[PDB]
Amino acid sequence: LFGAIAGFLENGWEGMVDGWYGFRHQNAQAADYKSTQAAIDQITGKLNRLVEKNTEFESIESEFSEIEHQIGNVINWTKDSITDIWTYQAELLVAMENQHTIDMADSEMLNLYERVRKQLRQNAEEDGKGCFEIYHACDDSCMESIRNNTYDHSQYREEALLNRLN
Amino acid sequence: LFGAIAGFLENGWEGMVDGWYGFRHQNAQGTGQAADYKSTQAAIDQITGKLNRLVTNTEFESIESEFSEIEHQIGNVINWTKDSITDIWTYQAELLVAMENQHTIDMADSEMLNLYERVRKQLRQNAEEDGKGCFEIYHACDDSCMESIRNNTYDHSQYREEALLNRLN
Amino acid sequence: LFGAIAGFLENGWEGMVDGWYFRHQNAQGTGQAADYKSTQAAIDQITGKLNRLVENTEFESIESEFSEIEHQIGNVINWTKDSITDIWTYQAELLVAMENQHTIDMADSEMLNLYERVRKQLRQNAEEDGKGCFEIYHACDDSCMESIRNNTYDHSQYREEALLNRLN
Amino acid sequence: DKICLGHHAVANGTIVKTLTNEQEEVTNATETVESTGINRLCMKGRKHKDLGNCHPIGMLIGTPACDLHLTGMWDTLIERENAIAYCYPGATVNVEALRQKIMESGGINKISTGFTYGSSINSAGTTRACMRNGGNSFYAELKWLVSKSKGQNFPQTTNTYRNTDTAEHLIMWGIHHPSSTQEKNDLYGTQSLSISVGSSTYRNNFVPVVGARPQVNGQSGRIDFHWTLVQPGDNITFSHNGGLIAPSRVSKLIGRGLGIQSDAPIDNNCESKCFWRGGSINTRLPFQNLSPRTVGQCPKYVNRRSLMLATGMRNVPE
Amino acid sequence: DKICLGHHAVANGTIVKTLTNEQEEVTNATETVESTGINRLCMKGRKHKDLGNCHPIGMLIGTPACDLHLTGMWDTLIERENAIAYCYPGATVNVEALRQKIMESGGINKISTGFTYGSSINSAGTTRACMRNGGNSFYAELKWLVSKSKGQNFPQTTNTYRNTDTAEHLIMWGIHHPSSTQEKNDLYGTQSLSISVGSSTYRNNFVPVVGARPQVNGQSGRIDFHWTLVQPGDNITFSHNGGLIAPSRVSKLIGRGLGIQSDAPIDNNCESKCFWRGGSINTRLPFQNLSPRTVGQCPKYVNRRSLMLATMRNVP
Amino acid sequence: ICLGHHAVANGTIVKTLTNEQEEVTNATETVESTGINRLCMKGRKHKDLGNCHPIGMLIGTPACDLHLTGMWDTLIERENAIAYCYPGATVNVEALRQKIMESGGINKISTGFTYGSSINSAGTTRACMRNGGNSFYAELKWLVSKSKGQNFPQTTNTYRNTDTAEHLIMWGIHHPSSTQEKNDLYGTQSLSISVGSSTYRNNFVPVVGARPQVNGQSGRIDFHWTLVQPGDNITFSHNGGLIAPSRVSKLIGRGLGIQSDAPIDNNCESKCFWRGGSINTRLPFQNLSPRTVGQCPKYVNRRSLMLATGMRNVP
Ligand SMILES: CC(=O)N[C@@H]1[C@@H](O)[C@H](O[C@@H]2O[C@H](CO[C@]3(C(=O)O)C[C@H](O)[C@@H](NC(C)=O)[C@H]([C@H](O)[C@H](O)CO)O3)[C@H](O)[C@H](O)[C@H]2O)[C@@H](CO)O[C@H]1O
Ligand SMILES: CC(=O)N[C@H]1[C@H]([C@H](O)[C@H](O)CO)O[C@@](OC[C@H]2O[C@@H](O)[C@H](O)[C@@H](O)[C@H]2O)(C(=O)O)C[C@@H]1O
Ligand SMILES: *[C@@H]1O[C@H](CO)[C@@H](O[C@@H]2O[C@H](CO)[C@@H](O)[C@H](O)[C@H]2NC(C)=O)[C@H](O)[C@H]1NC(C)=O
Ligand SMILES: *[C@@H]1O[C@H](CO)[C@@H](O[C@@H]2O[C@H](CO)[C@@H](O)[C@H](O)[C@H]2NC(C)=O)[C@H](O)[C@H]1NC(C)=O
Ligand SMILES: *[C@@H]1O[C@H](CO)[C@@H](O)[C@H](O)[C@H]1NC(C)=O
């Protein structure tokens, strides 16, 4: 389990229907494409792995005619054991890949909270919220500059340092 | 997998017994040990979740007589089937145990990393990290302020100035 | 899962040899080195996986190769053996897939860990550009870079001269 | 002035199971077990023969019910619940093997034995228990040999089927077991009866046995059926004092085909490859819980109602 | 001023198994494979039937040792190592199939066949090998038929049991096989013997055979047993010249039961659902170490002495 | 100071829980393939039967004279092995064959059967041949009247097991081609052969019928076998048709049975064998054959499975 979900974030936004991962902001809402794509491609990867899996089988037991009793209870025991095995394989599979699923969906959030952290650089500060604080007036252009992933910390450090230390 | 347990925290605290996860501090008054409830409880809850998964019926009858002999061919066709099933299940047991243990350890390690992160974000500017798991606190912290951090009540801003002036000199 | 290898480190270096996980600049020139401990830490885990892989109960024949076999029992055997084969196949695919996921993601982790020990070591004296490189605000002779690799690096020594550069 | 990073949530999310948590809410999920299958038999892309009330053995011996299934080719052979194998009361030895062999086939061809009989043999013997149209009759592929004049001793006879093919042929005969010590005398005479059969790979002998038995389909007598595989180049000899129900033709099982036991109505629009006693299953899903017992390209059956595979993050909102 | 972060450890650390490391120290771990068994049969909450030295076949044919087990109702049937099925040396065709059939039953009932015999037949033949109350006897559900006069030809005879029940019935008959010609002629006569059984769904012809063999229980003769199911509203007919061990009663296997072959003595205060040859198993674990041959609703047998499961990395 | 991972010019690809096409620096396979097509019998005291069938050991067909007795930890059977020089069959042949193939040895104990002067035991066929002349099963004798046409006398022969381990006894019954050649060999009598021990009772009647010539022979000899316990005796009471046992066989210990037409390489070890060759590997999975024998790796329906031994490769 990574920090992001069911952790320092206390809530998920029902308003966001456009993507899994998003940006909200006070200013004077959007969602990141690449992160969602990264998180959905891997759900489709084991959706893909799961959907296509089979050997041809014949009818060893008969429906309409009584079979020899010893070979019949041997067939019943064999079938019952194969059924138990496959049920266990099944429950293990779904529990493992659900675990992996959630843990990853956490990881792809944190991977690009760690993008933003390292893009804002020293021009912003970490909070308990998980919702970054900007100390300098960024218009809708600065914020878009956050989300596109082109930007320049250089162009604002001289400014923001003055706001952090006074 | 995560830096904390086998990495930048070299050793564990045997003396502390209440929790999986803990706070220890030094201040002008003295040194204190306490435990953070939620962080330990999450991991305990997932452990007992596993144990709950570990513990239903399908009813099998005997296909091998033990006091009467069995026909040869069918007998060791049955020996074959049962040995194959046994191999399958023992392999399943080893795989299940190994992978579940790996996940368990990396889970606990994850919870420790989460506590470390929560504390760091909580402290903000006022403290700094040596890569030993501790936070250099540059403003004097009262014990009430110590379990202000432990509570998560702690407000960084109120001490914000002092540490800062301490930080730059 | 973890951030570094496919997330913000935008490629791998071929030049690196006898190491899985260091490049600088300074003034004297540029030298490349590989960290021993992290790589051995990953390799040991991989070897553990392989040893776990290579660690068999005896079976007799139940089908006659060279002669008649009673149709019905033969069909029972064919069903059973093909079933067991199916199960073992599924287990093989499941193991290889999950082992691979764990291998890649764990190695990625082993990178991230080094990135974080280095960040926590450089502390105030440096900055993050976000390709995992660290910006050093006070030169640094080849010996200093060597100190960074070595972990002998004291941060307070360069702290002040660095902070001043940070602010101006 | 700030910026917020967060994950999305839904109004109604679905619960799954994980390693460490039961009842773990998630944004979305898809099941991995299929609990619903078509009631009809889906046979598109498959040329098939439906037997209805004709049992597979009947094809090999010629029970009237199987008249329109004495010959044919098929991807897929469908057998039904109460299909008729015998018009004249009897049984077959190692019947299940044979029936399976027939369901494992992809067609049958029939071939005259060319058997001819002596003037003192009535090879047109019929029975009330095997009706074709309104007439008394018998199995199409078999002839019930009795002495032409009631009561005379049935002549010592010898008929040898000669196989000149590059494949094996399945051959089926019958043995009559009369009801009354009179009936026997009126059919084969009073002599001690015996019926030896023998090829390069098969040897056996059959004594008819008069016994008091309950009447099945208005007959106390019984015909027991016996069958063997005659190899290429192999001859098979019948030596009989009377009692032999003897093959007019012989059967060549051909190819490989999927045998199905069911009562589901056939359907020719729906595509499938996995079949069971009621209906068919076609699903992307790897797992299934309808039938523990299935035929063909089939998803592994598991004893669970549902296994939801989560397709997203934890569902957590306000 | 410091604030620090840390985990606990112990002096004694549990070594567990992982994907990447065979021996990882961990705080605490538990077993997932049971290695301990009760050593009793826990029949509480179960209507059970301990057969003692009564082999299930004997409940059908009426072996002396099975006098207490000729009719019953149970959900669990226990057979024992020292079970007797044949007091008189013989065999049963499809013995294992039949035994498994009985062991899946949840009860047996008896029904008279109503068979009677003319005064040329001794119906009350006995033997030393089957003692009941002190004194010679014979299978409680069968009658040994011999000529009433030590030399005469056994009379051609016909007996028909008709099933008038709504359930199938399990009939058993025997076919004696004398050691000598003298003996043969004495029991059934000098004539050529033949038995024949016939129903809607069944038809067979048996013939007695004289041969010399060793003696079992002081007996050189044989009694070969045969059996069949008889559908409702059907007749089964025997036509015999002698040598037929004829059924006096027929059997009706009722319901379903669990069939346990075990050494262990019963505890009627244990609850349990999983059993094996010695004792039973009551665990919550998913795997088991005791026995590859268990019966019932049991954990799965693994070929591993121990498989420990971690409940963090314990570094001190 | 910068951080980075390695990479290679050309990467090997692996399947992954989420990705079926994931490039990786290096990898190793987890399946074995194209294994040694030969028989690795190192250390194994083995025994190659060649054209001799397992049952042939028991009844002593000429092809099997070199295999009548011996010990072994591994028994190899070849495809066209001759079970019967004289045409016939065996009741429960597969049980016998498997029994033999799980045996570590066969020892022969003489039955001791002796016969009166009106009985000829020296009967032989061209179907069975040694030194290019007519012979018979070396462990059985074919009993016919000494005077052609006469009645075979009622005869009794009891094998007595006086060992401390069970013995396996085989006998043959002869079913004549015609009513003539029956009377000639045994007479006009009604025939019968009853066998009985303390654990076994069976009766046999020789049957006359026309049949195609196999190996130039229209007659048949079917085989039967039973186990005789220690201290138990077995009696043959017979009238004509019995192919009597002159010796009896004892299976000793266990031994792995291999069915294979592959040549014996005596200088390699193995734990695993199939129809052609052997398998030698650490790998848990293999795809050479669904039907294997011994301490083998599991068989899987895949041509290849790659296990990533390295991190993800990003050039
Ligand atoms: C005439 C007489 O009674 N003689 C005494 C012998 O009975 C006795 O010898 C033993 O005889 C045994 C066989 O005895 C029975 C039996 O099984 O108990 C007697 C049964 O009444 C008879 N039953 C029927 C229905 O015929 C039964 C039967 O003929 C055979 O079992 C058929 O195989 O035989 C047995 O052969 C012993 O080995 C033998 O010693 C001796 C010794 O006590 O005393 C005689 O005075
Ligand atoms: C013990 C004995 O009687 N051996 C005979 C043997 C048998 O009588 C016969 O196999 C029983 O079925 O027959 C032998 O001759 C058979 C042989 O005879 C030729 O002349 C004939 O032309 C061949 O077709 C063939 O039938 C035998 O060799 O088996 C002689 C032997 O002495
Ligand atoms: C079993 O025996 C009974 C009695 O003989 C047979 O049933 C009788 O049934 C027939 C026709 O169904 C009647 O004509 C008789 O009057 C009945 N007899 C009595 C006394 O009920 C029955 O047919 C036999 N079962 C079989 C299958 O042959
Ligand atoms: C089956 O019968 C045929 C004929 O009865 C046998 O083949 C014949 O072979 C012989 C030997 O060459 C010839 O003399 C005949 O002319 C052939 N007859 C015919 C019509 O082909 C054949 O050997 C018998 N097969 C077996 C297996 O016994
Ligand atoms: C040891 O593990 C068991 C099983 O999970 C648990 O009951 C026990 O509490 C653990 N020990 C301690 C000291 O917690």
Ligand SMILES: *[C@@H]1O[C@H](CO)[C@@H](O)[C@H](O)[C@H]1NC(C)=O
């Ligand atoms: C075996 O034969 C010997 C000698 O004939 C005899 O002592 C013994 O009683 C016989 N064994 C049996 C079990 O009949």
